[PDB]
Design a protein around this motif. Structure first.
Motif, PDB file in Angstrom:
ATOM      1  N   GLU D  51       0.818  -1.237   0.000  1.00  0.00           N
ATOM      2  CA  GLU D  51       0.000   0.000   0.000  1.00  0.00           C
ATOM      3  C   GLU D  51       0.837   1.266   0.000  1.00  0.00           C
ATOM      4  N   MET D  52       2.012   1.210   0.631  1.00  0.00           N
ATOM      5  CA  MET D  52       2.972   2.319   0.555  1.00  0.00           C
ATOM      6  C   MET D  52       3.349   2.565  -0.925  1.00  0.00           C
ATOM      7  N   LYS D  53       3.660   1.519  -1.670  1.00  0.00           N
ATOM      8  CA  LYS D  53       4.005   1.663  -3.089  1.00  0.00           C
ATOM      9  C   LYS D  53       2.843   2.278  -3.858  1.00  0.00           C
ATOM     10  N   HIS D  54       1.613   1.858  -3.550  1.00  0.00           N
ATOM     11  CA  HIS D  54       0.445   2.437  -4.212  1.00  0.00           C
ATOM     12  C   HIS D  54       0.321   3.933  -3.867  1.00  0.00           C
TER      13      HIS D  54
ATOM     14  N   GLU E  51      12.381   7.866   9.290  1.00  0.00           N
ATOM     15  CA  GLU E  51      11.304   8.071  10.252  1.00  0.00           C
ATOM     16  C   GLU E  51      10.320   6.901  10.309  1.00  0.00           C
ATOM     17  N   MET E  52      10.127   6.229   9.184  1.00  0.00           N
ATOM     18  CA  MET E  52       9.342   4.996   9.154  1.00  0.00           C
ATOM     19  C   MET E  52       9.972   3.953  10.094  1.00  0.00           C
ATOM     20  N   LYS E  53      11.290   3.802  10.035  1.00  0.00           N
ATOM     21  CA  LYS E  53      12.000   2.843  10.899  1.00  0.00           C
ATOM     22  C   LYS E  53      11.827   3.225  12.387  1.00  0.00           C
TER      23      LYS E  53
HETATM   24  C1  HEM Z   1       3.011   3.617   9.955  1.00  0.00           C
HETATM   25  C2  HEM Z   1       3.719   4.387   9.136  1.00  0.00           C
HETATM   26  C3  HEM Z   1       4.747   3.695   8.236  1.00  0.00           C
HETATM   27  C4  HEM Z   1       5.594   2.732   8.610  1.00  0.00           C
HETATM   28  C5  HEM Z   1       5.786   2.095  10.002  1.00  0.00           C
HETATM   29  C6  HEM Z   1       6.365   2.354   7.455  1.00  0.00           C
HETATM   30  C7  HEM Z   1       7.330   1.383   7.454  1.00  0.00           C
HETATM   31  C8  HEM Z   1       8.184   1.110   6.432  1.00  0.00           C
HETATM   32  C9  HEM Z   1       9.320   0.244   6.552  1.00  0.00           C
HETATM   33  C10 HEM Z   1       9.717  -0.470   7.849  1.00  0.00           C
HETATM   34  C11 HEM Z   1       9.957   0.233   5.382  1.00  0.00           C
HETATM   35  C12 HEM Z   1      11.227  -0.526   5.009  1.00  0.00           C
HETATM   36  C13 HEM Z   1      12.402   0.250   5.628  1.00  0.00           C
HETATM   37  C14 HEM Z   1      13.694  -0.430   5.297  1.00  0.00           C
HETATM   38  O1  HEM Z   1      14.043  -1.377   6.045  1.00  0.00           O
HETATM   39  O2  HEM Z   1      14.360  -0.038   4.296  1.00  0.00           O
HETATM   40  C15 HEM Z   1       9.218   1.082   4.474  1.00  0.00           C
HETATM   41  C16 HEM Z   1       9.517   1.342   3.169  1.00  0.00           C
HETATM   42  C17 HEM Z   1       8.815   2.182   2.334  1.00  0.00           C
HETATM   43  N1  HEM Z   1       7.841   3.098   2.728  1.00  0.00           N
HETATM   44 FE1  HEM Z   1       6.925   3.076   4.538  1.00  0.00          FE
HETATM   45  N2  HEM Z   1       5.949   3.120   6.380  1.00  0.00           N
HETATM   46  C18 HEM Z   1       4.951   3.951   6.829  1.00  0.00           C
HETATM   47  C19 HEM Z   1       4.287   4.853   6.040  1.00  0.00           C
HETATM   48  C20 HEM Z   1       4.581   5.100   4.721  1.00  0.00           C
HETATM   49  C21 HEM Z   1       3.859   6.047   3.905  1.00  0.00           C
HETATM   50  C22 HEM Z   1       2.675   6.870   4.432  1.00  0.00           C
HETATM   51  C23 HEM Z   1       4.420   6.059   2.689  1.00  0.00           C
HETATM   52  C24 HEM Z   1       3.968   6.893   1.477  1.00  0.00           C
HETATM   53  C25 HEM Z   1       3.701   8.186   1.595  1.00  0.00           C
HETATM   54  C26 HEM Z   1       5.521   5.101   2.699  1.00  0.00           C
HETATM   55  C27 HEM Z   1       6.351   4.795   1.645  1.00  0.00           C
HETATM   56  C28 HEM Z   1       7.319   3.805   1.633  1.00  0.00           C
HETATM   57  C29 HEM Z   1       7.993   3.350   0.440  1.00  0.00           C
HETATM   58  C30 HEM Z   1       7.742   3.818  -1.003  1.00  0.00           C
HETATM   59  C31 HEM Z   1       8.977   2.277   0.899  1.00  0.00           C
HETATM   60  C32 HEM Z   1       9.910   1.449   0.012  1.00  0.00           C
HETATM   61  C33 HEM Z   1       9.077   0.273  -0.499  1.00  0.00           C
HETATM   62  C34 HEM Z   1       9.931  -0.713  -1.249  1.00  0.00           C
HETATM   63  O3  HEM Z   1      10.714  -1.467  -0.601  1.00  0.00           O
HETATM   64  O4  HEM Z   1       9.838  -0.721  -2.501  1.00  0.00           O
HETATM   65  N3  HEM Z   1       5.593   4.533   3.956  1.00  0.00           N
HETATM   66  N4  HEM Z   1       8.136   1.603   5.136  1.00  0.00           N
END
Ligand code: HEM
Ligand code: HEM
Ligand code: HEM
Lengths: 157, 157, 157, 157, 157, 157, 157
Positions: D51-54, E51-53
Motif C-alpha cells: 500500500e505504501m508503493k500504491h 522516520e518509518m524505521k
Molecule cells: C506507519 C507508518 C509507516 C511505517 C511504520 C512504514 C514502514 C516502512 C518500513 C519499515 C519500510 C522498510 C524500511 C527499510 O528497512 O528499508 C518502508 C519502506 C517504504 N515506505 Fe513506509 N511506512 C509507513 C508509512 C509510509 C507512507 C505513508 C508512505 C507513502 C507516503 C511510505 C512509503 C514507503 C515506500 C515507497 C517504501 C519502500 C518500499 C519498497 O521497498 O519498494 N511509507 N516503510
C-alpha cells in the motif's frame, strides 16, 4: 530407561565435581587474563569449557536414566591468589574428581551399566590430560623460576 | 582501576542472578531435549549461553575494578516439572533479575560509573528480549492448547 | 584365531536378536510408508539398517574367532497393527536385546575377550539410543494425542 | 501537465484509502509479531509495503498532473483485538477501496485520462489479490479451527 | 511486560511526531522529484524511510510494554511551496520532535525504563543528524544563491 | 544547532586533554621505537591514534553545537625518561581525563544533551581500556622484573 | 648517533611549525565539513595528515640524533572565519615554514648532515605542493566568484 539409583547418585556427585571445576577454572582464567597472562587464560578457559561439556554429558545421561540432575548444590571453590596457588588448587580438584570417577566406573561395571561406564572412562581420560598439563606447568615454574615463567605466559601460543 | 565498592557489590549480586539462570535454563533445555521438544531445547540452550556470556562480562568487569568475583554462592533454582511450569519459572527469574538490574543501573549512574552502567543496560536489553519470548510462548500455550503447542516443538525451527 | 566357545555362543545369540530386529523394523518402516507416515518410515528404516550393520559385525567377529554364524534360526517377530503397538513392540525387543548384551559383555570380560567386549559396548550404546527414541515417541503420542502425533509424521524431517 | 480536477480528486481519495491501509496493516503486522504469529506478521507487513508503493504512485501522479497530494486527512482505522476481527477489518477496508477504485477507473476513462486509468487497474489487481488472501485465511480459520489456525502461523513460510 | 503508563504516552507522542514527518518528508521528496531536483528527492526520501524505521521501533516497543499504539491521530503537516520553505518546515518539525525526545528520555530514566531510554537516545542521534543536514543546506542556499543551489540539485550524488 | 555553553566548555576541556595525550603517547611510542621496544611502540602508537579519533569527535561535536574548538592551548606534558616512568605518566594522565569525562557526562545528562553524553560514554570506555592496559603492564614489570620485561618488548606481538 | 646540536634545534623548530599546521588544517577541514564543503574538507584533512607524517619524521630523526623532541610548545594558530581567510592563513603559514626549511637545509649541508638535509628537501617539496594548491584555489575564488566557488566544493572530487 530406568537406571540404577546408585549409578544416578554417582552421576550427580560427578556432575557436582564438574560444576565446581567449571567455576574455579573460569574464574582462574579471567584472573590470568586480567593479569595479562594470555597463555594461561587460553588454557584455563578451554579447561572450563571441557568441564562444561562433561557436565552436559552427565545431565543428559541422568535424564535418560530417569533421574533428577542436581545443579543446586555447589561444592567448595578454592580460588587462590597467585599463579602457583591457583594451579595447585586446580590439580587438587582434578585428583579428587579422578578418585570419584574411578569409584563410579567400578560400580557401574558391577551393575552392568556399561554405557555410563564408557562415558565416564572418556571423561577420566580428559581429566588425566588436565592433570598432566597442571603437573607439568607446576614443574616448569620451579625449573625456570617464577619471573621467567610469567614472562612465558604473556603471549598466546 | 579501583572501582566503587557498592558497584562491585551490585555486579556480584547480578553475577549471582546469572549463575542461577545459567543452570536453570541449561537443565530446562536438556529436559526439553529428553522429551523430544527440540525447538524448546534450542531456544533454552541459547538462553543459557546468553547468560554465560553475561556472567563473563560481570567477572571481567569486577576484576578490572579490583573486586573479587563470587561464584561460590548459588541461589535457589526452581526447576519445575512440566513445560508451562518451567517457562513460568524462567519468566519469574528474569523479572526478578531485571528489578536488580534497574537498581544497579540507577546506582552506577549516581557514582558516575558510566561504563558499568552501559554494560548493564545492554544486559537488560537482552533480558527484556528473553522476557518477551517467554511471555509470548506462555500465551501461545493458552491460545492453541497444550497438545498443539507440544506438537509445534518437536521439530527444530 | 580360536575364540572362546561360549563367547561365540553369545555372539550367535546376539546375532539372532539383530536378525529379528532387522525384519521387524523393516516391515514396520514399510507399513509406516504405506500409511503415508514418512517420518516414521525414515527413522525405522534407518534403525533396520543399523541392525544390519550390527549383524555384519557379529558375523565377521564369529568367523574371525573360528565359529559358525547362525543365520538359520529366526526368532519370534511381533509386528503389531497400529503405530503405538508397533513402537511398543520395538521397545520391548530392544530391552530384551540389551539384557542379553549386558550378560555377554560381562562374560566376555571374564574370559579376557576384550575386543569382542569393546564391540558389544558400542552396539549397546547404539541400542540405548534406539530405546531413548522409542520411549520419547511413545510419550509424545500421549502428550499431544494420536491425531496430532500422526499429523506430525506425514512430512520428512 | 494540467490534469482533470475530478481525476485529481479521485486520486486523492484513493491515496487517502491507501494511507489508512498502510497504518492498519502495519499495526496488525506488529500485533501478530508480538503474539508470535510470524507468518501473519510477514504477510501483513508486505501488504502494508504494497500500500505504501500504491500511495507513492498516487502522489507522483497527482504531482505530474499539477494537483496537491493530501496526506493530512487520515480516515478511520479499525484495528480489532483478535486475529479473525483484524483480518475481517482488513477485508472490509479492501472491499471499500475496490469500490472507489472502480468508480475512479470509470471516471478516468470518460475524460480520456487513460494513463491514470492504467495505473489504477494495476492497483485494483493488487487489491483483489489481497482480497483473495484475506477471504481464504478467514475460511481456513473456520475449516481447521482457531487453535490449529494459530499453530499454523507460528513459523515463517 | 507491563510498562509505565506515562512512558507509553510519551512513546505514542513520539510515534505521532514520526508519523507527521514520514508524510511531510515523503511529499517533499516527491515534490523535489517532480521539479527535477534529484539530489533533494534522494535525501528527503531516505529521511522519510528513517522516520518509518523509528515509527516501527515505537510501535514494537509500545506493544511489548502492553500499550496500544496510536496511528489514528495525525498532527499538522506544513508542506510549503518552495525549496527553502520546505526545508525550514522540516527543520522546525525536527526541532520540535527533539524537544519531546529529550523530555521523554529524562522521564524514562526517572522511572527506570532504561531500554526505552536507550532506544530513544539512538533515535535522537538520528534526528540531530537530520537537523545538521537541514541547517547546512539552508546555509548553502544563502551562500551560493538559489540559482546555483538549484543547479547543484539536479544530478544525483 | 546551538548547544549548551557549559557543555561546549566541557567538550573543549576534554579536547584539551586529548591533545596532550596525543602528543605524549606519540612521543612515548617513538622513544620506545628508538630503544627497539617494538611491542610498546605499536601499542602506544595505536593509543595516540585513538586519542586523535577522540579529538576529531570533540571538534566535530563542538562545531555542530556552534562553539569554537580550542586547539591553541596545549596543557602540560610529562614525558619521563624510562619505561616505567613513561607508563606511569600515561596512566596518571588517563585517570585525570577520566575524572573530567565523568563530570561532563553527568552534566550533559542534567541539560539533556544526551547525544554528547552518548559520545562521551564511548570515549570513556576507550579510556578505561587504556587504563587497564597500562595498569597491567606496570604490574608485569614488577612481576617479571625489568630485564625480562624489556626482553618481552623487542618483538612485535 | 650524536647529532649536531644546531641541526637538532632546527628540527625542533620545523617540528613546531608542523604541529601548528596539523591543528590549523585539521580544524579548517572540519569547519569546511560542517559547512557542507566536502571537497575542501577532503583536501585540508589530507594536508593535516601530511603534516602529521612530517612531524613523525622530525620526531624520529631527532631521537636518532639523541635530541629531545619538543611537542610542548605550540605556536600561534590563525583560524579565520570564512573560506578565503582560512586558505590565506594556511598559505601564509606554509610560506613561513618554507623559509625555515630553506634555512635548515642550508645549515644541515654546512655541517654535513646530509641525511637530515635529504629528509628536509622531500618535506619542502611536499610543502611547495600545498602552496601551489592554495595559491590556485585563491585564484579560482576570484576568477569564478565566491558563489560559484562554494558550489564547486559541495561534492567530493
Ligand atoms: C506507519 C507508518 C509507516 C511505517 C511504520 C512504514 C514502514 C516502512 C518500513 C519499515 C519500510 C522498510 C524500511 C527499510 O528497512 O528499508 C518502508 C519502506 C517504504 N515506505 Fe513506509 N511506512 C509507513 C508509512 C509510509 C507512507 C505513508 C508512505 C507513502 C507516503 C511510505 C512509503 C514507503 C515506500 C515507497 C517504501 C519502500 C518500499 C519498497 O521497498 O519498494 N511509507 N516503510
Ligand atoms: C561461571 C559460569 C559459566 C561461565 C562464565 C560460562 C561461560 C561460557 C562461555 C564463554 C561459553 C562460550 C559461549 C560462546 O562464546 O558462544 C560457554 C559455552 C558452553 N557452556 Fe558455559 N559457562 C559457565 C557455566 C556452565 C555450566 C554450569 C554449564 C552446564 C553444566 C555450561 C555448559 C556449557 C556448554 C555445554 C557450552 C558450549 C561449549 C562448546 O562450544 O561445545 N556452562 N560457557
Ligand atoms: C589535532 C590533533 C590531531 C588530530 C585531530 C589527529 C587526527 C588524526 C586522524 C583522524 C588520523 C587517522 C586515524 C585513523 O582513522 O586511522 C590520524 C592519523 C595519524 N596521525 Fe594524527 N592527529 C592529530 C595530531 C597528530 C600529531 C601531533 C601527530 C604526530 C606528532 C600525528 C600523527 C599521525 C600519524 C603518523 C597518522 C597516520 C597517518 C597515515 O595514515 O600514514 N597526529 N591523525
Amino acid at each position: 530407561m530406568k537406571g540404577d539409583t546408585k549409578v544416578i547418585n554417582y552421576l550427580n556427585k560427578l556432575l557436582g565435581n564438574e560444576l565446581v571445576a567449571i567455576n574455579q577454572y573460569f574464574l582462574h582464567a579471567r584472573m590470568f587474563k586480567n593479569w595479562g597472562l594470555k597463555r594461561l587464560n587460553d588454557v584455563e578457559y578451554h579447561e572450563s569449557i571441557d568441564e562444561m561439556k562433561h557436565a552436559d554429558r552427565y545431565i543428559e545421561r541422568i535424564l535418560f536414566l530417569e533421574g533428577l540432575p542436581n545443579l543446586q548444590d555447589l561444592g567448595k571453590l578454592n580460588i587462590g591468589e597467585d599463579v602457583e596457588e591457583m594451579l595447585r588448587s586446580d590439580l587438587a580438584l582434578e585428583l579428587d574428581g579422578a578418585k570419584n570417577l574411578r569409584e563410579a566406573i567400578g560400580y557401574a561395571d558391577s551393575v552392568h551399566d556399561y554405557v555410563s561406564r564408557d562415558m565416564m572412562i572418556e571423561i577420566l581420560r580428559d581429566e588425566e590430560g588436565h592433570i598432566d598439563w597442571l603437573e607439568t606447568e607446576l614443574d616448569l615454574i620451579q625449573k625456570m623460576g617464577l619471573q621467567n615463567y610469567l614472562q612465558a605466559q604473556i603471549r598466546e601460543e
